[PDB]
Amino acid sequence: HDGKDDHYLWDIGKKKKDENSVTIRQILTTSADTKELKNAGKWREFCEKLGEALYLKSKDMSGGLKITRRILGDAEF
Amino acid sequence: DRMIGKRMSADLRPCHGDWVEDGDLSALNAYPEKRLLLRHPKGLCPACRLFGTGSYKGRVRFGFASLENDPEWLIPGKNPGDPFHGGPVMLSLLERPRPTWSIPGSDNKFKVPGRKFYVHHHAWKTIKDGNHPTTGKAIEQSPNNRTVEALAGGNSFSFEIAFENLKEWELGLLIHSLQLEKGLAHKLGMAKSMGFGSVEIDVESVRLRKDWKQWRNGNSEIPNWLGK
Amino acid sequence: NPIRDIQDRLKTAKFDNKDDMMNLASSLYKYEKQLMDSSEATLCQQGLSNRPNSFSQLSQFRDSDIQSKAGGQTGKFWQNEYEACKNFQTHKERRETLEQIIRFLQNGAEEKDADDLLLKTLARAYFHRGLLYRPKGFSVPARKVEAMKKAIAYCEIILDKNEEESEALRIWLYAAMELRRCGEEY
RNA sequence: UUGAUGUCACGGAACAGGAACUUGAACAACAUCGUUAC
């Protein structure tokens, strides 16, 4: 809301010491132009499988009882 | 040593509040039993039952109030023949309130006082002319104050409040809180400590809901609810 | 009503016997299971009374369990849940409780740390759900057949380590004797 | 990687149920900084 480069999500990892510490904006900024992710088809799968890996890592960060989505009705006749 | 949350009685702290004790709650973060260490062991106060909270929807809805007459500004604008824009007025410094003047000491004797209600007076006749309220000197255009456009006294707005599943005494107290007595007045807006902002609210018709068909204007039950 | 019980169990928790720890885990599981679906006991918006003592006890319970995740908590709770499910009235509530058990404990049986009680009660839930399938096509529905097959698969998961069990072997034979009369092969 | 005298698989809708909702006046007055002297 101030206009500076301090977001609460896209700027995690920025400290006062060793100001070369990378943030998520810099990582996504240097990966959007790597001469192999320059066409449309190669960027789509990159974002898809990166999001899939982050979801798989976020899933098992709970402690309560976890319900499954849909496990019943596999009728194969 | 203690935070400001432990400087008042434990019954006046907000229910569904925060963690002020010494241990860190972030350890019980991935478990559902964490939320029970942040609520009061008795329930919800009378104001977190009409107005909502987190994990409970409130049952009173306000609305946008609209003007009905012509504006009638405070300072006439620079473009004549245009009765839809006012003139500017420069305010004073208006900076942050210190809470180390109501709690002066540091040990245990100094608790937290009440709720800081501003008083009604007439000190805008000195701002409108360009002077300071304390000293009589002029106001400079420093890069720390504001230049606003303000309405004058004598306007009339109109709004509407919807409510559901209220008791009788809750409606009586809400009407007592909307319309005050004959000599009193509310306060809203900016720069409340300089006289600016003094409204008075009157209550027009009240319509109830009997069934899904009829609605039964209930104006004849107000002197009951109030007393109740 | 489900929040006063947590505190009643937290008052006299001795952190040494395997009965009060089990009762505390049962109360926590029942409160969470009450929250997952939206019952009428969701309007209770109170909390726990003695904050620092209760925080110490709950952190010590969630900390002095991670070295003893032997499956002694959830297995016994779902065992008693199924045991209460068996002796019910009309089939509607039995069907709903069976599908809720199946949905809740299907995840915790896919690892190496798989208890024998957990797999045993999951196979019994599949077998008992396989009997309550109302036909509608002048023929047997395929979901009954695959419930029987899943029960066989889990009882084979248990009996792969041991040889005789006298409890899982009977479930295996019940599933086979049920597959025989549904027009299938042994 | 088929076997012959006999293939309706173009013989079969991945279909069916779930309010991104709840809570929040764009508001404001008392200082800041540490040492000097016997």
Side-chain angles (χ1 to χ4, degrees):
Chain A
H1 300 118
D2 290 77
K4 49 168 58 81
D5 270 14
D6 184 0
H7 205 276
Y8 83 102
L9 188 67
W10 305 111
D11 283 316
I12 306 174
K14 178 187 58 51
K15 299 186 285 289
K16 186 260 210 173
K17 346 289 190 184
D18 67 88
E19 300 272 0
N20 64 283
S21 158
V22 282
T23 62
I24 313 180
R25 194 192 292 259
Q26 308 178 355
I27 282 168
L28 289 183
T29 256
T30 176
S31 155
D33 41 358
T34 57
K35 195 36 195 57
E36 53 185 358
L37 311 185
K38 277 305 200 167
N39 48 1
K42 294 284 174 147
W43 172 250
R44 169 175 184 168
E45 40 176 50
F46 167 69
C47 316
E48 277 173 17
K49 65 174 72 151
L50 172 59
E52 172 76 19
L54 281 173
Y55 175 79
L56 271 175
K57 188 52 185 184
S58 90
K59 183 44 70 196
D60 49 70
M61 290 300 87
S62 176
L65 47 95
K66 43 179 68 176
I67 179 156
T68 43
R69 171 64 176 117
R70 50 129 291 156
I71 185 53
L72 254 175
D74 290 328
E76 199 171 352
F77 170 71
Chain B
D1 52 334
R2 280 159 304 126
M3 299 188 173
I4 206 58
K6 269 177 300 175
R7 286 305 267 265
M8 40 157 47
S9 168
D11 282 332
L12 295 165
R13 274 175 68 194
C15 31
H16 294 48
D18 213 336
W19 184 251
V20 307
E21 323 276 348
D22 281 329
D24 47 338
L25 208 55
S26 41
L28 307 191
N29 216 15
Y31 301 96
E33 68 259 17
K34 182 193 177 174
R35 78 177 78 187
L36 294 175
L37 290 169
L38 293 181
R39 311 178 166 177
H40 194 90
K42 308 292 275 297
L44 294 168
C45 50
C48 303
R49 273 191 288 173
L50 195 88
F51 305 89
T53 168
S55 69
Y56 188 62
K57 196 169 137 203
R59 38 196 219 267
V60 71
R61 298 183 288 121
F62 277 74
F64 269 62
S66 83
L67 197 43
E68 44 202 15
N69 64 336
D70 273 300
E72 210 187 338
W73 307 95
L74 172 63
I75 293 179
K78 75 180 204 261
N79 190 278
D82 187 22
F84 278 95
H85 281 272
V89 47
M90 211 190 317
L91 310 170
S92 280
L93 211 40
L94 261 182
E95 59 264 72
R96 59 161 188 117
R98 268 96 172 162
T100 72
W101 201 71
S102 318
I103 312 163
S106 156
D107 40 348
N108 266 3
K109 185 177 55 224
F110 301 105
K111 292 280 208 178
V112 165
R115 303 171 188 258
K116 209 188 192 175
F117 282 105
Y118 294 99
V119 289
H120 288 80
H121 55 102
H122 277 151
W124 51 272
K125 302 180 175 175
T126 314
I127 294 294
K128 195 193 59 174
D129 294 339
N131 296 155
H132 204 268
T134 310
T135 74
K137 300 156 157 48
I139 296 180
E140 323 87 339
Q141 207 190 18
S142 157
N144 268 318
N145 40 8
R146 275 97 173 90
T147 318
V148 302
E149 156 200 22
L151 282 176
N155 297 328
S156 316
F157 294 82
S158 157
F159 64 99
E160 185 203 53
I161 297 171
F163 65 94
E164 74 154 29
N165 279 345
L166 300 201
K167 285 282 280 159
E168 294 205 339
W169 62 268
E170 297 205 281
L171 191 46
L173 289 185
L174 189 65
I175 289 177
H176 264 309
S177 195
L178 266 177
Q179 64 166 7
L180 301 163
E181 263 78 5
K182 186 47 83 173
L184 314 169
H186 267 279
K187 189 154 265 272
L188 84 85
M190 208 196 175
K192 281 174 262 158
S193 66
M194 280 192 273
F196 283 107
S198 293
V199 307
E200 183 205 358
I201 303 176
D202 316 340
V203 173
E204 275 195 10
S205 73
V206 180
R207 331 164 61 226
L208 296 168
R209 174 210 193 243
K210 183 247 173 191
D211 221 349
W212 58 273
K213 297 165 275 165
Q214 85 157 358
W215 273 69
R216 199 191 37 99
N217 155 75
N219 262 320
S220 316
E221 298 184 48
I222 291 179
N224 187 7
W225 300 334
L226 288 162
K228 196 173 271 314
Chain C
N1 191 29
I3 310 173
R4 210 165 69 251
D5 305 358
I6 308 179
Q7 221 191 332
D8 285 352
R9 285 303 159 272
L10 268 166
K11 177 59 71 156
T12 79
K14 315 309 306 162
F15 262 64
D16 261 347
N17 61 86
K18 301 306 123 170
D19 315 298
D20 303 311
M21 204 94 88
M22 210 53 64
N23 289 5
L24 184 60
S26 156
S27 300
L28 261 63
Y29 281 151
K30 206 182 261 277
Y31 164 72
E32 178 60 295
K33 190 243 183 185
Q34 197 85 251
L35 274 190
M36 284 313 248
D37 49 69
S38 305
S39 41
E40 203 179 1
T42 325
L43 279 172
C44 290
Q45 269 149 345
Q46 34 173 323
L48 308 181
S49 316
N50 201 4
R51 276 182 182 86
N53 192 50
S54 308
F55 167 65
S56 88
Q57 275 182 348
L58 277 177
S59 162
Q60 212 178 3
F61 166 65
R62 299 302 202 167
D63 193 47
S64 193
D65 168 46
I66 57 185
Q67 77 302 328
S68 48
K69 309 295 316 301
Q73 277 100 343
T74 179
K76 292 288 300 173
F77 169 55
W78 290 117
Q79 168 76 247
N80 292 107
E81 210 54 49
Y82 178 73
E83 197 42 69
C85 166
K86 263 180 53 156
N87 42 1
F88 260 128
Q89 270 288 87
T90 173
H91 57 97
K92 300 290 186 71
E93 49 196 24
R94 259 177 294 151
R95 207 179 273 131
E96 289 144 50
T97 311
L98 271 175
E99 88 183 39
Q100 275 309 106
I101 281 171
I102 286 162
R103 260 165 176 169
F104 272 124
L105 70 103
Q106 214 271 335
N107 183 285
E110 309 314 282
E111 306 96 299
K112 190 52 152 94
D113 184 18
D115 194 289
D116 294 4
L117 213 55
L118 190 74
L119 285 169
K120 214 175 299 194
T121 190
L122 183 52
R124 203 167 255 131
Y126 268 149
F127 169 73
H128 195 194
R129 184 47 172 122
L131 300 179
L132 289 153
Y133 266 139
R134 303 152 278 175
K136 54 169 81 172
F138 277 13
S139 43
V140 293
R143 296 140 170 274
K144 170 158 183 168
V145 189
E146 264 165 308
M148 292 321 156
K149 281 171 172 35
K150 285 284 286 310
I152 278 170
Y154 280 123
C155 285
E156 208 173 25
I157 286 284
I158 298 172
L159 275 162
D160 191 3
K161 309 192 298 225
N162 218 351
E163 183 284 337
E164 47 196 66
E165 202 41 74
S166 84
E167 268 78 359
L169 196 78
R170 294 188 185 192
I171 306 295
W172 203 98
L173 264 70
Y174 293 164
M177 287 295 280
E178 209 42 62
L179 276 182
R180 170 62 252 189
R181 78 185 267 265
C182 289
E184 285 273 347
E185 206 43 69
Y186 274 128

